[PDB]
Each structure stands twice: as C-alpha cells, then as structure tokens.
Amino acid sequence: RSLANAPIMILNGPNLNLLGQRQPEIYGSDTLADVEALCVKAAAAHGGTVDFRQSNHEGELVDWIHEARLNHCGIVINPAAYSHTSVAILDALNTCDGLPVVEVHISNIHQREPFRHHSYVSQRADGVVAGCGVQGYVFGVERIAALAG
Amino acid sequence: RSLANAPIMILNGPNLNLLGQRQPEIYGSDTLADVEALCVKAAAAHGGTVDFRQSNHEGELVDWIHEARLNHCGIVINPAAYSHTSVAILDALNTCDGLPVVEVHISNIHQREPFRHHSYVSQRADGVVAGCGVQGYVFGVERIAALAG
Amino acid sequence: RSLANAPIMILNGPNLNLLGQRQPEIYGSDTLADVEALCVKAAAAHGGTVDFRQSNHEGELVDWIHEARLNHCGIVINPAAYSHTSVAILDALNTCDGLPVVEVHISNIHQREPFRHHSYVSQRADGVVAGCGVQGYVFGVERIAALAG
Amino acid sequence: RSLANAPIMILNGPNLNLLGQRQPEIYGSDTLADVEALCVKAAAAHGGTVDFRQSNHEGELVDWIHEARLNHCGIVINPAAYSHTSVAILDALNTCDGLPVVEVHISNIHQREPFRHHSYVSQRADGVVAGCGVQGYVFGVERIAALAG
Amino acid sequence: RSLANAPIMILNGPNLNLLGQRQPEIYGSDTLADVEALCVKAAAAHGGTVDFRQSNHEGELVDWIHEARLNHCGIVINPAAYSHTSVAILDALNTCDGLPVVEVHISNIHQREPFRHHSYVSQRADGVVAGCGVQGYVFGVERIAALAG
Amino acid sequence: RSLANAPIMILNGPNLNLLGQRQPEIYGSDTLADVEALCVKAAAAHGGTVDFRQSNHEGELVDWIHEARLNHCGIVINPAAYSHTSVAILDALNTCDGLPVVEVHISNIHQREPFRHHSYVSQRADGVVAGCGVQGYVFGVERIAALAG
Amino acid sequence: RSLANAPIMILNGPNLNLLGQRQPEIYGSDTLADVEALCVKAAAAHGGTVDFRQSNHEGELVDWIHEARLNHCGIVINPAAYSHTSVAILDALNTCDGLPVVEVHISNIHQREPFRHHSYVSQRADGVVAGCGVQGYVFGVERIAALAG
Amino acid sequence: RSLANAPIMILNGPNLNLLGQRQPEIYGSDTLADVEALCVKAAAAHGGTVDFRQSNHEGELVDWIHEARLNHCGIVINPAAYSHTSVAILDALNTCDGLPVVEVHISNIHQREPFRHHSYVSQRADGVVAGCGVQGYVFGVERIAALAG
Amino acid sequence: RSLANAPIMILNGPNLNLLGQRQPEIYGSDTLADVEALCVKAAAAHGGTVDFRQSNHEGELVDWIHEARLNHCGIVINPAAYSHTSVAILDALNTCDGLPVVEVHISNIHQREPFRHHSYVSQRADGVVAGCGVQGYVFGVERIAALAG
Amino acid sequence: RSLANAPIMILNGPNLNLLGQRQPEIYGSDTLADVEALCVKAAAAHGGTVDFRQSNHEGELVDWIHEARLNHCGIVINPAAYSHTSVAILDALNTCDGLPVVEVHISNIHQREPFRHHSYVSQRADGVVAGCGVQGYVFGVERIAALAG
Amino acid sequence: RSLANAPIMILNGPNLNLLGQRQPEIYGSDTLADVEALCVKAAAAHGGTVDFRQSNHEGELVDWIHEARLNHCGIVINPAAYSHTSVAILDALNTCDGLPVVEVHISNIHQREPFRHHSYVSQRADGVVAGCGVQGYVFGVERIAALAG
Amino acid sequence: RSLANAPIMILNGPNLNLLGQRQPEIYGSDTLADVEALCVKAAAAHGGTVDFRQSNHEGELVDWIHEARLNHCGIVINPAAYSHTSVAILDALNTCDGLPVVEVHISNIHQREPFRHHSYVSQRADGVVAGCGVQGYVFGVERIAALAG
Numbered sequence A, B, C, D, E, F, G, H, I, J, K, L: 001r002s003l004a005n006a007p008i009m010i011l012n013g014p015n016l017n018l019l020g021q022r023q024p025e026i027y028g029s030d031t032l033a034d035v036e037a038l039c040v041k042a043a044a045a046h047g048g049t050v051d052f053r054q055s056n057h058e059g060e061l062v063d064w065i066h067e068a069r070l071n072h073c074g075i076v077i078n079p080a081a082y083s084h085t086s087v088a089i090l091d092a093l094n095t096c097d098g099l100p101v102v103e104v105h106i107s108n109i110h111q112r113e114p115f116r117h118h119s120y121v122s123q124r125a126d127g128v129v130a131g132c133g134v135q136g137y138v139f140g141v142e143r144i145a146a147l148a149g
C-alpha cells in the first residue's frame, strides 16, 4: 500500500491512555489525543492519514498488526511495556513482509531501569526512535512516508 | 481516599479462580471465594469495604488498576504468574501516584523455581508479603487500613 | 477422560492463524486450516476427535486450559510465542493433574534466536516435539492417544 | 508447643539498635524499644508473650535461634544485613523442625540496592514480610499466632 | 538414498544398553531390545528398515554417523549423555548434508538437571522429540518416513 | 543558544568518510558529502545552520564536543564505533549541561552484532535514532531545532 | 610442630553443636561428642592428640586458627556455613604458612543447594573432604598425621 | 555386595598412566603402579580386594562402570579430565543404584584453573576427596570398606 | 566534631593483628603496632589524636562504628576480609551521617583474587585508598583532617 | 631516576581540562590549573618537581607514559574515562618495569555507574586512590616521594 | 628431539577424514590426503619428516600425544571439535614438557558459533593458527622447525 | 591488485615501538626494527614489498587502514591492545572488501589475562596467528602472498 491509498496504523500499548497525567518530567504533559492530533497533522503534511489506537492487551495489539499488514501502509508502534516482554508482538511484526515499521518510545529507555534497556520490537522495527518525546511519533510518521512512496 | 469512602481494590491474576482444587501442600485448601470472604471480614474490622476481583488477562488487570486509580483507597494484588512477567502491571501501579499497594503471595516464591524469585510488581508494591498463605491478603488489607486512614 | 469419551484440546498461540502465508521454509505451506485437518485425521485413526482452537491472547489460552482440565482428554499445544514469555500458560497447565499434555513446535526453536531456545511450557508439558513440521501435531495426537488409554 | 505456653522469640540483626535516629523516610520514626512495644501489644492481642532481642553478632543470633528451638514457640526475625550474607543464620533456622518462622523487612528490600534483593533467610522462613514498616512485625506475630496453634 | 532402498540408522549413546534395569519412573520398563523392536515395527509400517546400534563411545558414534551419510536414508539418534557434551557428534551430523536426522530423548530434558537442558545435536537435528518415552523413537522413524519418502 | 544565534554541530565518528562506498544494503548509497547536504537543507528548513564534521580520532571528537559546548546550540552525533567503546565521548557529552544532544545511527544497531546493541552515548543523548538511515540525521536536526526553540 | 609435640586442632563451625538431633539422612546420628571421640581415637591411632572445639562465631573461629598456628601441628576444619561466606577464615588460614589444613564436609556439598558448592576454605586448605560422613574427620586426622610426622 | 565377596573397582582416567614423571609439585612422584600398590594395601587391611584400571577412553570407563555395577562392591574413581567434561560417566554411575562411589582427585581442583573447579562425577559420588595426594585413594578405599559393610 | 575534640577512629579488620608476621612481599614488615604509631603521628601533625582498634569479629566492629558515631571526628577503616563480605559494616557506616569515612587497603586489591576486587565498604566510604602500603592509613588520617577541619 | 634527579610525570585524561567548570558536588570547584599548583606545591614539600599534563587522546597519553618511562621519577595518573576503557594505557604503564605508578580518581568511582567501577589501570598502578577529591593527587605525589626518594 | 632425528606428529581430530567432501566455502576444496601431502612437503623443506594421523576418538588422540611425547620433535594439531570439549587432550598436551605444540584450525573459529570461540588446547599450544586455510598447517610445520631447530 | 602491484600494509598498534626492551620471555628480544627487517625479507621471498608502520593511535591505524583499502595488496596487523577494545579498527577492516587481512599476536593471548582472550579484529581478519612469536608476521606475510598473488 501507499500513503495515498491507505492509512499509517499508529499503535499504542499499555498505560498510554493515561499519558499526560503524570511524570511529565519523563513523558511531558501532552495527552494521548494530543499525540494522535500530532499524527494526523504529521500524515496530512505528507498526503496520508493515520489510524490511531491504544490497548492494554497484547493479543489485540497483535490482532491490529494482523489488520495493518493487510490494510495499512505502515506502522508506527509504541509497544510501551510490551516493548520489553512481548515476543508475540515481535512475531506479529515479523509476518509484516516489507510493510515498514517504526518503534517509538517517548522516554529514552537506555537511561532508565535495566529491564527497560532491551526491546523485542527493535528486532523487526526498521527504525527506532527514543527520547524524542511525542515528536518521535512525528518522526515515525515522516519515516513511514519516506519509505512507503 | 479513606477506608470509609471507598473499597480496597483486591485483584487476582491467572489461575487463581482455581484456588482450592489442587496442590494443598503449597497453596492450601481455601478457595478464592473463601479468600474473598476473609478480605470482606478484615476490611470491615477497620471501617472498610473491598472490590475483590480475579482475571487471567494481563490487560484487564491493567484496565482495573486504571479503575482503582480513581475509585479506591488502595490495592491488594496477588499478580500470580504475572508477577514474574508483567512489566505492564508494574507500569500500571506506577501511574497510581500516592496510593498504597500491597503485593501478596500465598507461597514463599523465594523457596521455589528461580523465575518465581523475581516480581516486577515488588518494584512498586509498597509492601510485599509472601508465603503467609491466604492470611497474607489479610495483612494486605490490614496494611492498606494502616496507610489509608 | 479417555479418547473415545472426550476430545483432545488443540491449542495454538499467537500469529498461527496466519501460517502458510509466508516464510514457509521455516513453517511449511500448510494453513492453520490444513493443520486442523491433519489433526481431525490423526485423532480419528485412534478413535478420537479434537477441539481445535487458536488465540492471540494469553488469558484466552489460560481460559481454554481451564476448560480442557474439565472437559477433555488431553492437550496438544503450540504456544507459539508464549512458550517463551508465559509463566501464566505454564501455571495453567500445572493445574492439570494427570492430564496428558504435549508441547508442539513446527520449527526447531533450538536453532533459532537465542531467546526462543527456552520454553516455559516445557517445564510441565509431558512431551515436546520440535522441528518435526506440522507433522509434530500428528505426533502430538499420537502421544495423547497412547496416554489417554 | 502452643502460643499459650512459650514466648515467641523476636530477633533483630545488626544496626537495628539505632532504628529511629535516621532515614525515617526508609525505616520510620519508631525506635526498637517502640517496635518491641508493638510486639508485646501484638502478641497479647493473641494470647501470647514475646522474648525480644537485638544483636550485631552473627553468631549470637545463631545462638539465640538454637535457644528458641527448645524454648520458644515461634520466631519473628529481621536479620537486617545478615539477611544478604548469613548462611549461618539460614542453617540455624534450618535445624528448626516444625517451628514457624516469619522473616521481617521494614523496608522493601526489592526496591533498594541489588545486593539487598536476596535474603538467605528467605530460603527457610515460612512467611517473608517486607516494606510493611514496623507494622511488618505485627504481621510476623499474627502469623506465628496463627500457626503456633 | 531413499526409504525404499536403505535402512534407517538408529544410534543410541552411552548407557542406553541398560535402559530398563532401573529408574522406570523416568525411562519406562522397556529394554534396548524392546525399543529396537518397536523401531522394527514403525519402520515397516511406513515401508522401511532399520540399522539399530548402541555405543558408549563418542568416537564410534561419529564413526557410525559417517557411515549413515553414505549407507543409510537417515538418522534417529538418542545421544544420551553426549547430547549435552558432544560437539564432535554435532559436527558429524553437520557432514550429513541433506540427510534427515531426528534427535530423541526418552525423558523430558527440560524438566531435569539444568545441564541437561542444552543439546549440541539439537543444533543440527531437523526434528527433536523429547519426553515422549520410547514412543519418541516411533515418531522419529515416522518423520524419517515422511522426509525420506 | 538557538539555531538563530548558533550552528548545530553535527559530529561524525570513524569510517563515516567512506559512507556510501560498499554494503549499500546496510548504510546505503548516499555519501558523507550527500549526508551533510541533507543536514544543510534540514537545518535551513528550521531557521538554522550546521557545523558538520567527521573524525576517526576519539580524542578529537571529544575536543569537538567541547567547542560546541561553548559555541553551538546543539549536537547531533553519529559516534559510529565509538558509540560502543567510548567512555571519553559520553563524559564529553556530560560536560554539555543544558545542551540538547541527539544520537543517530544509520542502521538499526539492535538488529546487528550483539556488541553493537549497547551505546555509551545513549546514557546522555536526550534522544537516539537508529535504522532510519540518513533520514535519521534529519530527525536529529528536527529534534535539535525543536528543543532549541 | 609434630603430633608428638603438639595437638591437631579440630575446628567446627556453626550449628554443628546440634549435630545428632536431626536430619540424619544427610548428617547422620553421631553427635558432636561422638565426633570428638571419633577424632581422639584416630589421632591416638596414628600417634597424636586433638584440641577439638566448636563455635557459631566467625571471629572466634579466626582467633582459634591463630592459636593453632603457634601451638598446634595441623588444622582439620568443618567451617559449616562459614565455608561459603567467610573470607576471614580463608585469610586466617593463609596466615598459617606450611601449617597443614584439611577441610571437612560431613555432606557432599556438590549435591546440595548451589550456594553450597563453593568454599572459600577450599582455596587454601591443603586437602578438602566432602560427603564422607563423620568419617571424613578421621581422614583429615589421618592426613595431618601423614603430613606432620 | 560386601567387601568379603567382590573386589573394589579402582578407575583412573586419562593421562594418569604417566603419573609420577612431572609436576611432582602437583601430583607427586608415586606412579600408577605405586598408587595401585597403596590400594592393594588399603583394601587388604579392611578385608578386601581391588580391581585397578586406567583408560584414556571415556566410553571404556563407562563399560567398566557398567561392569562394577554387577561384579564389584564399589567404585573409587579418579576421572581425571573427564570429571569436568563427562556427563556420560556421571550417568554410568547414576545407574548403579545403592553402590558406594567415592571420587578422588590427587590435586586440590579448587586451587587450580576455574575449568577444574567443577566435576560432573561429584553429583553422584557419595564422597569426594580432593587435595589429599595419592593418600586420597586410601581414604576412598576406607570409605568404601566402611560402606560395603 | 573536629580533630580538636574527638579522636579519629581507626578500625582494623580481621587478621591484621598478625600484620608484619608474613608475606611482607604483599603487606610489608611493619607490624600493626608500627601502623598505629604511624597513625598517632599523622594525627599529631594535624592537631589530632587517634583511637586505634583491631578486631576479628564482624560484630564488635559494628559496635565500634556505633561508638565512633557519637564520639569521634571521622573513621579510617581497613575492613580487611570484611570489605568483601560484610553488608553490616557497610550499614553500620551508613549510620554515621556526614561523618568522614576513608577506607584503606594495604595491598592493591584490584590485582588479587577476583573475590578481593569488590568492597561493600567502598559504597559508603567517602574515599578509598589501596596499594599504598601502610602509608595509606596516613593518607586516611590526612583526608579526615582535611574534612573534620 | 629519582625525585632529586627527575620530575614526577603527572598525567590527566579526557575532559579534565574542564575541571571546576561544572558539577562541583561531584568533582569540586578547583580547576586543573588549581590542581597543578597543588602538585607543584605537594612535590616541593617533599624534595621534588612535577611535569603536569592533560590530554583527551588515548595515544598521546601513551606517548607521554613512554616518555616518563625514560625521563621522570614516577607517574601519578588520573586516566579519567580511559581508566575504564584503555588496555593500551595499562599496557603502556606495564612497560615501566620498576617505576612507581599511582592511580587517582577524584570521585569515588565505586559509588557511581557500574561501568566506572573497574579500571584497567588498577591492574598495574601500584597505588590507587579514589574519593579523596583533588587531595588524592597530593597523596599520589606523597606516594611517589616515599617510593622514589 | 630435532627435525633431523624425529618426525613432527600431526594429529587430526574428529570428522576431518571428510575434509574435501563438503562446505569448501568454509573448509576448502582439498582433502586430508591433500593436507597430509602439504605437511610432508613443508617438513621436507626444513629437512624434517611428519607422521600424519586422523582420529574421531578422543582417548586415541590422547594415546598418540603420549606417543608423540617420546618419539617426535613437535606436535601440530587440528583437534577440530575436541578443541572445544577436551580438557583431556589439553592435559595430554600438558604432559609434554619442552615439546613444541602448534594448534591449527582451518576455519576462523572466532567467526563461528560462539561455542567455537574457545579451545582448551590453546591454553597449552605454544602457537595457534586459525582460518588461514590448509595453509595454517604449513605455518605449524614451519614453527615446529623454528623451535625444534 | 596483486603482490606484484602493491606493498603489503603492515600495521603495528600501541606500545610495539618498544619491542625488545622488556618481556623477552613473552615477546622476544627482537626490536620493532628487527621485526620490520623480517617482514621485508618475508615479502621479497614471495616477490613482494612491505609498507611497515607503527602507531599508538587508534584513529591513525584507522586512517592507515583506509589508505590500504586504496593502495596496498593486504594487511598484516598486530593490533596490540586495540585488539581488545577497538570496534573502530574492526569497522576499519570491515570496510576492506576482498582485501586479505591477517591478525598477529606475538604472545598467545589465550594463555594470558582473560580480557586478552577476546579481540574484535578477529571477527574480520581472515586469519589470526598467535603465540608464534614474530615468526607470526612471516606467516602473516606468507598468507597474504598466497591470497594476494
């Protein structure tokens, strides 16, 4: 698919619903609809749209990767916690043959807890953006656009 | 919140619906409904009520820690197997700024298989109780009373 | 339960719905539907039937394992990526006192990524077939047949 | 050897003589005398007495463990720093057939330094209580009260 | 070579000569003769023959593997102790290009002593079957049937 | 300092001078001159200039991080190999208090040799981009331009 | 020193005062008094005399090795739990140049918990005996005789 | 089998043929002939005999262990290098339900190279003597005599 | 407290009482008495006094750190073996708030046995000095002077 | 070469040029220039002179080590970052048979990130001082005097 | 023994009988007869002869080292798989005091699976050549000649 | 390019400038200039010339390697200490497609400090020569001549 012909799937994993409500010194005060708004503007700036979701359930994120592989031109995914534990999500993205994928972490995970240092997604994520705050979704977006067409 | 306003959320993770039915030597012969009754008792004796729940679904448990965040005076969680795996629930509890959390295990995990040794949830549980059998959630309830009112 | 009296539960974990559609030199070219078919066949030859399911959700799998515990003669399981991350699954099958359980892998995970080398389910599962193709489902059904009898 | 006819032995390792002069944001405001008072109030709460002790010597705590074996009905122990070092104390508690043993940590040791996550005594203690404040000690006694008859 | 014109080589490694004088709780009551016999049946069932041997000698196993690389249609092997130690058999198997090879463990090694969890032979063995009791050989003969037929 | 008053220093480590001369599968066909010229255009588009440099010398990258410290509004750095070996550069970057720093990798380093998975610079770099190709440099300037504004 | 002139020192670490009263399937039914008597006899047997003592205190143990170093002809030592924790007794022992030392473990430690398989004592001790029953103390006596006379 | 009824099997592993010709600092200057002689002595003194062998071949030691299992009253073994590498030989010994095994090492393996620190044989041997020189064999024979009666 | 009014506590770990008496090629020929003389001179030069102690006993040192806590201007400790072993002495010293602590090793521990590389006391001591012989103490005194005045 | 005949090489590693320009809690507020002044002073107090240097470049420090090998009486070195990275600087100091080397870090590196805990240089430095601030330079000079002069 | 009066023993480990037959992108197109041929040619050139052997058996190889021990001027070995598993060949090679030992691998093992990275033999081999093709065998002869001549 | 068209680049890393001056038993009595003279001879002997260099500097060896990529027929390189620390250099050689690289260590690093055991360069070097003295340079040149001409 192209951006002209289909949306970017944007995917958000657990706890991100409450984004903007706390520890803004690590995550900022933008809320999750604030992020979504960025991504609409971001894709619009390039022709495309986005389809922005959030779930706290690993199987659903997996089900939405299944959909995107089929119906969308690329994925910007913040796996959030499942970044560090989900092989099922990684595997979901391994079936996405030549659908581009960007991982995105609002905080720089390399400077926080050692569990945080490692991510399964980065194994498939074509690129990975970290510590760019919610602007990094915007990079995820520009990247998807550059690649998809 | 106080004990007098809002109920202590009590959350139970995978397999625990089945508590009562096998391995007496490790887990006891009380069932989950009995556990729930022992908590009703304990909270009461301190002016409190409880919203006692179980689920096998990591994300639902996230959802519910989301709920208690707004609506309860504290959380008693037996994460069950999700203690050793779930960066998700760990993260959920961390959105619970201010609120007391007591993790409970029925078995002495420290005496068991290596992977049972670490709980992500103890990164955030205010208190941890292990191998005190089901009397352990009583301690939870007691300690939520202590910190709450 | 024995063979003639109840079904063998056959469980598939995440992404396997999708099997056949790529990387076949790792997975084969059989759909999940051909796998179910092979299974109906194998149970049949030994006078049994199968209760054959897939799910991308871990809790849904534990749920199904509770069911099997009650209603079925054994389990053949490909946990797909929870093999690796799911103490929840392990624990659920642990609750299955004298239920014959076989763990099945289409690929030989011991030749793959270091992180796939290890399975939680192998700690309970009675037998484990790896790298024997979709046919290991068939050995999976054969072994239950020998045990459930 | 019920709770009715023998004291609970209550042991405190190195440094705890000075409890309350520092880090009350970690260890509280209560002195050990105070703690000891809780212990008395908590044992009589359940129709028992306590024999409460503190020592900076590893071998004297070993000696007091052997004393409780013949003389006492249970042990409540916060082994302090020896928790992370003392196989002596572990081994002495091991000679303690039948006798109940709750291990106590006022602080959540799993939230502090990596060398504080592991406790030798945990490999024997029946209950391990942590992060529960000096109230962690009432729990210990409540747990002996329950097991000791 | 093919199933129709060459025996299946079946190699057994150290101590299997005594299989079934002791620890039936792990190995069953069937002798090595009984197992060869089962392999005689399962090979016929599929249009085949077997060349079943056993040696306590790591070098003779290599010797024999080299042989099968020309004389036999494939290899089922239970390396017994040399599984966890023999890079030399590993490497003998690696010279058997396009030859089918199933590794067989009667016990489930993943449920045993930790140094039994890793196999060298697994790195090359196309299929690995663990903890299926001697029936593991039949399965091993069946996959050779399938792949060599 | 802003892009307004000040050039964004963009620092490149060893072997970068050869960029676009072999292995285009990994690093591409764009060159070091080319890449700079993206940088120019990307700093232009956000009201700014670049100070774009390469070096094989760890000590001179250090010397250069000190320059910028006093004279530039930000650092975008692809440390190349020094990202994995260089405590000097990180300590350089840490002398850069209240200066924005963005680390770039052409490749996804998390998809490569295990020794490439860790970066020292990532303990200071506010943000980190990886496996977005030289676009990633553009992201780096976009982030610098943002933070300095 | 010789057996003629000077006793062999027999040192017993913590808990070994209780030897006899429990866990006989590991440590047996002989008592510390029984062992002393066993050792007097093995010394009498080979020309010598013993100075046989037992302590729960690491520093006393240490003190006594200093004494052995001036006044005695050998050290045979069961350090008990100290074998695994005590750098102090290791170095107490290293102060004893060309004094004979045999380390004694009633139990065979390479068969117990993993913390038990390492002894600091073994680093210096001339000989180490393990798993030979209280009889291994008679081997130390024997060994010291061989060495001192 | 008692001592009055069968020889004690003495097994010597690789390299020991040349015992005596070098590192008299670590091994002494008594040759194998000489060790063998010390054992004829030891056994006689205790009412018995020795069947004394040496092999550089791992499988040959297993053969002989299979043998002693049935024709002998017990094993004293110096596996030499194969203490560290041979799981096979470990399992040869496992098979000997109720036979007394004692492992001997002439040097103290806990003072040499880390790769010598660990022995697979120790996991079965009832006793281990290390660091007692050629006299350890003699302890091995006394231990068996003790046990074979 | 300052040099003027309170002695510098100088604590010496186990074994040091025998300082001088051997391996002067690692620790020198000065005796502990010589070192105390050094300390009395270094403090004198500074308008100070010292309180020079030595114990083999982990716990005694705990009591003396508690005594220095209220009665001295700083501490110069050589914990000797206890550096590497003793969390209590660490915890003890952490109780001395805003008291200058200097840790002193005579040998350079970073060149010895890998167990002697790590000191717990180094987590607290404001400063650590190794491999400067007995002169290290004198540096230890000078540092306290600098910091008690 | 002696204090009388030759200066002390005092060597400073990366980033130490900027000493006193930031985080004085951690490194103090003297400049490198101030430090120099102290060392001229400290060596004068003791009949000596100094050659005080700083460089960012691993290899030039190596050049300067080689130079001091032939020209100076000893080396006081603070290798900054290359303490932790630089085998070459260690190998260099290694070339200085018989020359006094003292390693100095201002901050107590053992109290920081794990990566600052190990120093290659500690492997050859005769003395190592850390956590004494800039005074520790003074001790290094004092140490060289005693060793040289 | 020099090259004039004695042949160099060239010892070849498991599987190398099959060199030529497969994987020439990894091991080369030449056979062992071909290698032997080189070795003859290279010894000839330095006035020496070679005694060239291959075994798949570990104790055989050990036998031939003991033989080379008294009858040859040096050893060249490609222990192939036993480089990574055989402490017994290492120890065999240790018995050869004064004998020049060169170890050779045709493949560059430090590029291979991570278990291929470590060779017991390299702990005793005076030189090790790896990944210089069958040519590495000639350097071996060359080196032995340097050292026996 | 061939041995006929261009010199062999011979790179010498840190500290090698001082060869001969110390550690003859480790490195020999040859000087750097002596080494070079062997290398010249070594190449003429094969109808080749050398370009022989040394530097203490990481980045300049990098620079030299880049020059060789253009101008030389191959690299012999003894990275010295940068062997264990330099991904810069590895990556410098990674740039050198189709250029024969031989790595040389005078000593056998696999016999030395555990950190010497690993070299990054070996990951790319076609061959590694070790412990062959400065004869390994001659072997390195040989190899290059084989590969290059």
Ligand SMILES: O=C(O)[C@]1(O)C=C(c2cccc(Sc3ccccc3)c2)[C@@H](O)[C@H](O)C1
Residues within 6 Å of the ligand: A014, A015, A016, A017, A018, A019, A020, A021, A022, A023, A024, A027, A078, A079, A080, A081, A082, A083, A104, A105, A106, A107, A108, A109, A116, B091, B092, B094, B095
């Ligand atoms: O930084 C991230 O984007 C990250 O991926 C996101 C995470 C995270 C952690 C806790 C909470 C939340 S959501 C949130 C953020 C701010 C306020 C409230 C909720 C996200 C973690 O799971 C990851 O480890 C890091």
Ligand SMILES: O=C(O)[C@]1(O)C=C(c2cccc(Sc3ccccc3)c2)[C@@H](O)[C@H](O)C1
Residues within 6 Å of the ligand: D014, D015, D016, D017, D018, D019, D020, D021, D022, D023, D027, D028, D078, D079, D080, D081, D082, D083, D104, D105, D106, D107, D108, D109, D116, I091, I092, I095
């Ligand atoms: O939390 C505990 O109860 C703990 O067991 C007790 C400890 C401890 C550590 C230092 C001092 C003290 S005692 C104290 C506490 C607060 C103020 C004064 C003294 C206890 C640590 O040894 C353990 O790691 C944790």
Ligand SMILES: O=C(O)[C@]1(O)C=C(c2cccc(Sc3ccccc3)c2)[C@@H](O)[C@H](O)C1
Residues within 6 Å of the ligand: E014, E015, E016, E017, E018, E019, E020, E021, E022, E023, E027, E078, E079, E080, E081, E082, E083, E104, E105, E106, E107, E108, E109, E116, H091, H094, H095
């Ligand atoms: O399960 C297996 O087949 C296995 O390969 C078999 C093994 C084994 C272990 C001990 C003895 C024997 S043979 C035997 C079996 C039963 C009774 C007596 C001997 C095999 C182990 O060596 C392996 O770890 C696992």
Ligand SMILES: O=C(O)[C@]1(O)C=C(c2cccc(Sc3ccccc3)c2)[C@@H](O)[C@H](O)C1
Residues within 6 Å of the ligand: F014, F015, F016, F017, F018, F019, F020, F021, F022, F023, F027, F028, F078, F079, F080, F081, F082, F083, F104, F105, F106, F107, F108, F109, F116, L091, L094, L095
């Ligand atoms: O991906 C990167 O940006 C990276 O920093 C760049 C690296 C790298 C590796 C080889 C060569 C070069 S520079 C180059 C690129 C293409 C052709 C020639 C040289 C960089 C590695 O040092 C790092 O792992 C990864």
Ligand SMILES: O=C(O)[C@]1(O)C=C(c2cccc(Sc3ccccc3)c2)[C@@H](O)[C@H](O)C1
Residues within 6 Å of the ligand: D091, D092, D094, D095, G014, G015, G016, G017, G018, G019, G020, G021, G022, G023, G027, G078, G079, G080, G081, G082, G083, G104, G105, G106, G107, G108, G109, G116
């Ligand atoms: O086996 C030994 O002699 C050993 O020294 C003894 C130990 C030990 C452990 C617990 C208790 C005792 S003593 C004892 C034995 C039986 C009953 C009562 C006390 C010894 C362990 O600490 C060591 O791991 C090994």
Ligand SMILES: O=C(O)[C@]1(O)C=C(c2cccc(Sc3ccccc3)c2)[C@@H](O)[C@H](O)C1
Residues within 6 Å of the ligand: H014, H015, H016, H017, H018, H019, H020, H021, H022, H023, H024, H027, H078, H079, H080, H081, H082, H083, H104, H105, H106, H107, H108, H109, H116, K091, K092, K094, K095
């Ligand atoms: O100490 C032992 O008895 C030991 O079993 C014996 C060994 C050993 C090593 C090399 C040679 C020999 S035999 C020998 C002794 C002296 C000179 C020549 C050969 C034994 C090692 O393999 C073991 O780790 C330790």
Ligand SMILES: O=C(O)[C@]1(O)C=C(c2cccc(Sc3ccccc3)c2)[C@@H](O)[C@H](O)C1
Residues within 6 Å of the ligand: G091, G094, G095, I014, I015, I016, I017, I018, I019, I020, I021, I022, I023, I027, I078, I079, I080, I081, I082, I083, I104, I105, I106, I107, I108, I109, I116
């Ligand atoms: O180097 C030290 O000063 C140290 O603190 C002191 C130690 C030590 C070790 C053995 C003996 C002694 S004291 C001694 C010295 C010579 C003869 C007798 C006793 C100290 C080690 O425990 C520590 O690793 C390091």
Ligand SMILES: O=C(O)[C@]1(O)C=C(c2cccc(Sc3ccccc3)c2)[C@@H](O)[C@H](O)C1
Residues within 6 Å of the ligand: F091, F094, F095, J014, J015, J016, J017, J018, J019, J020, J021, J022, J023, J027, J078, J079, J080, J081, J082, J083, J104, J105, J106, J107, J108, J109, J116
């Ligand atoms: O503690 C030290 O002296 C150390 O040697 C010095 C270091 C260090 C770290 C950052 C900056 C500086 S220099 C500096 C000091 C103040 C302001 C600016 C730069 C030194 C680290 O490289 C080392 O890990 C530790």
Ligand SMILES: O=C(O)[C@]1(O)C=C(c2cccc(Sc3ccccc3)c2)[C@@H](O)[C@H](O)C1
Residues within 6 Å of the ligand: E091, E092, E094, E095, K014, K015, K016, K017, K018, K019, K020, K021, K022, K023, K024, K027, K078, K079, K080, K081, K082, K083, K104, K105, K106, K107, K108, K109, K116
């Ligand atoms: O590279 C080597 O020389 C090596 O020593 C040789 C080995 C090896 C492994 C399997 C087969 C062969 S020989 C061979 C070559 C081509 C076809 C068939 C067999 C060598 C491995 O055992 C070692 O890890 C590496």
Ligand SMILES: O=C(O)[C@]1(O)C=C(c2cccc(Sc3ccccc3)c2)[C@@H](O)[C@H](O)C1
Residues within 6 Å of the ligand: J091, J092, J094, J095, L014, L015, L016, L017, L018, L019, L020, L021, L022, L023, L027, L078, L079, L080, L081, L082, L083, L104, L105, L106, L107, L108, L109, L116
């Ligand atoms: O052995 C080598 O060839 C080596 O390449 C060279 C090294 C080395 C180390 C210190 C000094 C020198 S050069 C030297 C050698 C002897 C006397 C003087 C200088 C080389 C080591 O760094 C490496 O670990 C190995």
